[PDB]
Enzyme design. Structure first.
Site, mmCIF file in Angstrom:
data_model
loop_
_atom_site.group_PDB
_atom_site.id
_atom_site.type_symbol
_atom_site.label_atom_id
_atom_site.label_comp_id
_atom_site.label_asym_id
_atom_site.label_seq_id
_atom_site.Cartn_x
_atom_site.Cartn_y
_atom_site.Cartn_z
ATOM 1 N N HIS A 68 0.817 -1.233 0.000
ATOM 2 C CA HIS A 68 0.000 0.000 0.000
ATOM 3 C C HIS A 68 0.834 1.259 0.000
ATOM 4 C CE1 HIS A 68 -2.987 -2.932 1.556
ATOM 5 N NE2 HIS A 68 -3.777 -2.243 0.757
ATOM 6 N N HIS A 72 1.373 1.598 -5.815
ATOM 7 C CA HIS A 72 -0.015 1.136 -5.833
ATOM 8 C C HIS A 72 -0.912 2.284 -6.249
ATOM 9 C CE1 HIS A 72 -3.844 -0.682 -4.574
ATOM 10 N NE2 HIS A 72 -4.028 0.323 -3.740
ATOM 11 N N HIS A 106 -6.172 7.388 -2.761
ATOM 12 C CA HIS A 106 -7.132 6.522 -2.100
ATOM 13 C C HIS A 106 -6.577 5.762 -0.939
ATOM 14 C CE1 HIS A 106 -5.412 3.055 -4.166
ATOM 15 N NE2 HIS A 106 -6.154 2.291 -3.386
ATOM 16 N N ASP A 107 -5.259 5.596 -0.892
ATOM 17 C CA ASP A 107 -4.617 4.870 0.206
ATOM 18 C C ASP A 107 -3.610 5.778 0.973
ATOM 19 O OD1 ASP A 107 -5.789 2.234 0.574
ATOM 20 O OD2 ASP A 107 -4.624 1.420 -1.087
ATOM 21 N N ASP A 217 -8.703 -0.753 -7.715
ATOM 22 C CA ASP A 217 -7.988 -1.142 -6.531
ATOM 23 C C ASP A 217 -7.475 -2.574 -6.584
ATOM 24 O OD1 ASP A 217 -6.910 -0.570 -4.078
ATOM 25 O OD2 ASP A 217 -8.810 -0.901 -3.036
ATOM 26 N N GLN A 269 -5.739 -17.616 -2.737
ATOM 27 C CA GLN A 269 -5.907 -16.838 -3.960
ATOM 28 C C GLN A 269 -7.150 -17.248 -4.752
ATOM 29 O OE1 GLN A 269 -3.886 -13.892 -5.309
ATOM 30 N NE2 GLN A 269 -4.215 -13.990 -3.104
#
Ligand SMILES: O=c1ccn(-c2cccc(OC(F)(F)F)c2)nc1-c1nc(Cl)[nH]c1-c1ccccc1
Ligand SMILES: [Mg+2]
Ligand SMILES: [Zn+2]
EC number: 3.1.4.17
Length: 313
Positions: A68, A72, A106-107, A217, A269
């Protein structure tokens, strides 16, 4: 004004594609973002001097965490750029402005930990924001940076256009709280199936913009296998660090976050592709047909994980 940004030929072509990797050269990421803004919005929408200064303050406020991080941020903005460029007439001018900045921000100031760990740690941000903790902080960080002197890239918008864009950004950022994704997609699926979906209904756009944010995202699952495979390492590096911190608090973490249960990643996953990614990009393709390459790339990667379990890699 007459200063366009240009990229080398491979990048100029490859940047238009959904599966584009921004590369390992950090110092080109800002130009890549401005290139995207100018092509997506116009050479006019932001004052270059103010934008470049916004970008650098944003970068400075992402931390040196494994996933993050600043890369990213730019990768997520790029996926949205691909979506906006493939759905040209569907989106308003303010929306195109808001969403790219929303993705970049956004992060902001993410520390590598889930909303759950903050709550269990009893971190002050968890008292200030009971739900969507980090996400409410990300938006707060965004507004703070917009209020630095020389940083208001929206200065030449009218009062109402200004409240409109900050609202687009706030909803977009909150929407990256994956706890809200499930209900949001369920409702969009219900509305698309029953035919009630209506892009002039503002609240319906809101939802559609939310799904786009979830899609951007998660877009690491839509890259070429080697990009996806290597990004997965970074993602699990944060997860296991968090698992370590849970155990420090006397809490046994979920298996996803336990570095003892490293063996179970491939299966985890699959769960994720099946429970989250695949449904997300499916519903997004239905609502926005030209985003299909994202669904196809995601399916291809699900299958690459199936090959991992089967001992074929
Ligand atoms: O690779 C992954 C495996 C698991 N999870 C995951 C993350 C929350 C919850 C959950 O469980 C539940 F299925 F119940 F939602 C799973 N997320 C990813 C992932 N991949 C990409 Cl690209 N981005 C993420 C991601 C990163 C931070 C936060 C969220 C997603
Ligand atoms: Mg986040
Ligand atoms: Zn994110």
């Amino acid at each position: 004004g007459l200063m366009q940004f240009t990229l080398p030929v491979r990048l100029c072509r490859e940047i238009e594609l959904f599966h584009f990797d921004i590369g390992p050269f950090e110092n080109m990421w800002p130009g890549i973002f401005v290139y995207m803004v100018h092509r997506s919005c116009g050479t006019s929408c932001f004052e270059l001097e103010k934008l470049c200064r916004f970008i650098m303050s944003v970068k400075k406020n992402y931390r040196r965490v494994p996933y993050h991080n600043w890369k990213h941020a730019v990768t997520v903005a790029h996926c949205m750029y691909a979506i906006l460029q493939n759905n040209h007439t569907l989106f308003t001018d303010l929306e195109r402005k808001g969403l790219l900045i929303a993705c970049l921000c956004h992060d902001l100031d993410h520390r590598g930990f889930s909303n759950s760990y903050l709550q269990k740690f009893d971190h002050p941000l968890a008292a200030l924001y009971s739900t969507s903790t980090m996400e409410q902080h990300h938006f707060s960080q965004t507004v703070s940076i917009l209020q630095l002197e020389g940083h208001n890239i929206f200065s030449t918008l009218s009062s109402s256009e200004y409240e409109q864009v900050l609202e687009i950004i706030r909803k977009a950022i909150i929407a990256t709280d994956l706890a809200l994704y499930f209900g949001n997609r369920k409702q969009l699926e219900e509305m698309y199936q029953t035919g009630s979906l209506n892009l002039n209904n503002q609240s319906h756009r809101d939802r559609v913009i939310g799904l786009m944010m979830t899609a951007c995202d998660l877009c690491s699952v839509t890259k070429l296998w080697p990009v996806t495979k290597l990004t997965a390492n970074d993602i699990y590096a944060e997860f296991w660090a968090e698992g370590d911190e849970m155990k420090k608090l006397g809490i046994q973490p979920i298996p996803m976050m336990d570095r003892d249960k490293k063996d179970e990643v491939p299966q985890g996953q699959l769960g994720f592709y099946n429970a989250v990614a695949i449904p997300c990009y499916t519903t997004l393709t239905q609502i926005l047909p030209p985003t299909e390459p994202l669904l196809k790339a995601c399916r291809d990667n699900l299958s690459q994980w199936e090959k991992v379990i089967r001992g074929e890699e």
